[PDB]
Design a protein around this ligand. Structure first.
Ligand SMILES: CC(C)CCC[C@@H](C)[C@H]1CC[C@H]2[C@@H]3CC=C4C[C@@H](O)CC[C@]4(C)[C@H]3CC[C@]12C
Ligand SMILES: *[C]O(*)C1(*)(*)=[C@@](*)(*)[C@@](*)(*)=C(*)(*)C(*)(*)=C1(*)(*)[N@](*)(*)[C@](*)(=O*)[C](*)C(*)(*)(*)([C]*)[C](*)C1(*)(*)=[C@@](*)(*)C(*)(*)([C]*)=[C@](*)(*)C(*)(*)(*)([C])=[C@]1(*)*
Ligand SMILES: CCC[C@@H]1CC(=O)N([C@@H](CC)C(N)=O)C1
Length: 432
């Protein structure tokens, strides 16, 4: 009641006293490594597992399980400790999958690494947010979403360089897809190695009755900023946390948030996995009328296209508003997806999905900052993790359907995603 509000006000006051600029900008990279690992795994699942009947979409079920699990645990065990555990699991099994002599065993040891990386985004966003003050929280949570694209481009370049060929078979030994799989673990290994040097969030320590082990974290933040400026029953506890997200105070918020998350993720993941298929079909039909580098090129161009949108969102959200930014950017993403149909030619279709990405990254940034503004640290990571599990389910729902529609229908998935984003924007415009 009064204790929670007093704690939130006092923690915001102390966090604003600690200052911003050095500790936060270091933890930003330390956690961007984890997000880059997330993007790497997502790329390998969506655009490299088919290269070996949509059996690669089992890794997304793994990721949904892992997101829910690690998100729920991170609110009881710690944001940093559970980020360590999740990244460690992902890294160990991404390592394993390269030494494995099959696909029935490679897919399992990669499903478990997908489970690992499932809980990266919820914990990273809930963990970085415990260190950021109110007037910088949105702007500095918006820069994280670029590391996802950086990880995706990393994965695409490694694929095009080590395994540009479609040959991917496990039996011989010391292949070149094994080298790729090992090399795609590197962002995760660095993320965990760097993350073992950042302190667990002070908000979590305060919530966990650890006032001293929170004061040490806070004094570290202050000293780092200034010197550089100058001078089980645990399952029952996680269930309580989750069933609170649908209490009288969070049922409305949680349901509308679930809808926005699910629809945005459905549209985005379906569209982005379909678009290379659309390009390949377009060029195959063009050839009939008369590889991995194409996916790398479009990955690079998309990573550059979300850039101005990410910068504008990050710099503006503190004044345009998180609710308003989410609503407007979701409307713009809907309309740009509707326009995506016109790009009759590949040369023009690349640019229309560039537009989709550029105008939709602002909605994603607003969503990720809003799902941390609307929940308390007592349940922030559980709520974020559940909503990210919904995002992974949407990603399967969207990648399966749209891939099914590749050739048989021309502007089917464009219209599916336009309607989905319209529903998502309708829900987003209603949030508090
Ligand atoms: C190179 C191009 C494609 C980059 C485009 C960047 C996007 C993300 C930018 C450009 C103009 C921006 C919009 C300008 C003004 C507003 C105010 C209000 O209505 C809510 C957000 C909204 C609607 C902004 C959302 C983000 C926005 C759509
Ligand atoms: C580089 O983006 C990422 C990030 C993580 C995983 C994969 C990946 N690449 C893709 O999904 C392939 C898409 C075609 C990239 C893309 C996305 C958007 C919104 C616009 C463009 C032009 C390309
Ligand atoms: C335009 C790119 C949107 C991507 C898709 C995705 O899944 N993103 C994560 C970033 C941690 C998110 N906002 O949840 C961002």
């Amino acid at each position: 009641r009064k204790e929670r509000e007093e704690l939130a006000q006092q923690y915001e006051a102390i966090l604003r006293e600690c200052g911003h600029g050095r500790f936060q900008w270091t933890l930003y990279f330390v956690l961007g490594l984890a997000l880059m690992a997330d993007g790497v795994e997502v790329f390998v699942v969506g655009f490299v597992l088919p290269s070996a009947g949509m059996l690669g979409l089992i890794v997304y079920l793994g990721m949904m399980v892992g997101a829910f699990l690690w998100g729920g645990l991170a609110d009881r065990l710690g944001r940093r400790q559970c980020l360590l555990i999740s990244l460690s699991v992902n890294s160990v099994f991404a390592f394993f999958s390269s030494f494995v002599q099959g696909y029935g065993t490679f897919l399992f040891c990669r499903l478990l690494s997908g489970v690992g990386i499932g809980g990266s985004i919820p914990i990273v966003f809930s963990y970085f947010s415990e260190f950021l003050a109110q007037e910088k929280r949105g702007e500095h949570l918006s820069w994280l979403c670029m590391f996802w694209m950086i990880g995706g481009v990393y994965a695409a370049a490694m694929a095009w360089a080590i395994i540009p060929h479609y040959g991917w078979s496990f039996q011989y030994q010391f292949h070149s897809w094994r080298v790729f799989v090992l090399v795609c673990a590197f962002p995760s290994v660095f993320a965990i190695g760097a993350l073992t040097t950042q302190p667990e969030s002070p908000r979590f320590f305060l919530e966990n009755g650890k006032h001293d082990e929170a004061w040490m974290v806070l004094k570290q933040v202050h000293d780092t900023n200034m010197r550089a400026k100058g001078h089980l029953s645990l399952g029952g506890q996680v269930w309580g946390n989750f069933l609170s997200c649908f209490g009288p105070e969070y049922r409305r918020i949680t349901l509308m948030m679930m809808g926005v998350w699910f629809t945005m993720s459905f549209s985005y993941y379906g569209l982005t996995v379909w678009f290379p298929d659309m390009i390949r079909h377009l060029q195959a039909v063009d050839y009939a009328s008369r590889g991995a580098y194409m996916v790398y090129f479009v990955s690079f161009l998309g990573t550059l296209a979300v850039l101005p949108g990410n910068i504008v969102s990050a710099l503006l959200m503190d004044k345009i508003g998180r609710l308003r930014m989410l609503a407007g950017s979701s409307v713009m993403s809907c309309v740009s997806c509707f326009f995506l149909s016109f790009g009759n030619s590949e040369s023009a279709m690349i640019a229309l999905l560039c537009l989709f990405g550029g105008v939709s990254i602002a909605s994603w940034n607003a969503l990720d900052v809003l799902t941390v503004e609307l929940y308390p640290s007592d349940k922030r990571t559980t709520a974020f993790g559940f909503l990210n599990a919904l995002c992974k389910l949407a990603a399967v729902l969207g990648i399966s359907i749209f891939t099914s529609f590749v050739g048989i229908t021309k502007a089917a998935p464009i219209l599916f995603a336009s309607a989905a984003l319209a529903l998502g924007s309708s829900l987003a415009l209603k949030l508090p």
